[PDB]
């Protein structure tokens, strides 16, 4: 558990439907939600592969479970009952435990993605912005739409607003 979902970001966004993780920006030109295309796409692909691995790895053969035994073969019938119940027990335990573990893995995967996104933005901004606590950064300079889409792409330009941020600090 990496302390993001329910951690330092205590809420989710319902107006954000284009992705799973992303940004909410407020500048002079406006405010809005935008998804992180790369992280969302990677997460979608990984979860799709996960579901397909859980489902399709199960191989089956043509089986005819169920046999008929007359009264003088109560031992073979009991053996068949034993075979059936053992398989049922094994498969029940395996299915329940696999789902229980895999749900954990998925939730921590999402938490990790949110935390990593936050870390990336933070290491891009350095001291040109400040961390207010709820997952937001207040810019010491003026970041317009171009600067914001630069942040949401990995192409921030710290030695372009370094002087303005130093003056406003």
């Amino acid at each position: 558990l990496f302390g993001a979902i329910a951690g330092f970001i205590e809420g989710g966004w319902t107006g954000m439907v284009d992705g799973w993780y992303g940004y909410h920006h407020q500048n002079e030109q406006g405010s809005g939600y935008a998804a992180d295309l790369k992280s969302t796409q990677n997460a979608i692909d990984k979860i799709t592969n996960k579901v397909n691995s859980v489902i399709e790895k199960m191989n089956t053969q043509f089986t005819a479970v169920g046999k008929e035994f007359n009264h003088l073969e109560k031992r073979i019938e009991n053996l068949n009952k034993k075979v059936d119940d053992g398989f049922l027990d094994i498969w029940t335990y395996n299915a329940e435990l696999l789902v229980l573990l895999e749900n954990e893995r998925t939730l921590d995967y999402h938490d990790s993605n949110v935390k990593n996104l936050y870390e990336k933005v933070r290491n891009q901004l350095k001291n040109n912005a400040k961390e207010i606590g709820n997952g937001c950064f207040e810019f010491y300079h003026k970041c317009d739409n171009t600067c914001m889409e630069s942040v949401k792409n990995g192409t921030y330009d710290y030695p372009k607003y370094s002087e303005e941020a130093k003056l406003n600090r």
Binding site: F62, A64, V65, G66, K67, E68
Partner: protein, 55 residues
Amino acid sequence: KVRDQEGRMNYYWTLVEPGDKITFEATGNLVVPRYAFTMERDAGSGIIISDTPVH
């Protein structure tokens, strides 16, 4: 008495391979075949005891 029958009738079955022959000898008490079933068998399956309709 079962079905108002004091006597009984045992029923036997056999599978004859291609090229083989089946011989019946009898002084009495024999219910002879009238129809035989030429069959070629699959891998295997089951029997379902249900009242569900067939579609």
